[PDB]
């Protein structure tokens, strides 16, 4: 990551942009597996094998409460969503495919956000 992403404290203005990014992901058709925490009754051994679960509702709470100090930390939580999903699910699963699609969408939005921050 670039130095602004790593070092620049997130401001209130930055948080408006973070909320916009999160809302765009929540609204995406392929976000359905990531909207809320993984249900243990749907996913055998999940919480036994996934050390740091994450989901979009948890990130929404963190954005509201100003949890993140640096953009890198917001990106790290988001990246957990996708990495956890690819870790636990087979590559031919619809879940895995959702992670591939939504991650690409997130990267597009994130670049947009970083650009906007820079001007």
Numbering used by the authors: 2793 to 2911
According to the publication:
Bromodomains (BRDs) are protein interaction modules that specifically recognize ε-N-lysine acetylation motifs, a key event in the reading process of epigenetic marks. The 61 BRDs in the human genome cluster into eight families based on structure/sequence similarity. The four helices form a deep cavity that is extended by the two loop regions (ZA and BC loops), creating a largely hydrophobic Kac binding pocket.
Interestingly, most of the 43 BRDs tested were highly sensitive to modifications flanking the Kac mark. Similarly, the BRD of FALZ showed no interaction with non- or singly acetylated K4 but interacted strongly with H3 pT3K4acK9ac. For instance, recently, the dual-reader module PHD-BRD in BPTF has been shown to specifically recognize a combination of H4K16ac and H3K4me3 at the mononucleosome level (Ruthenburg et al., 2011).
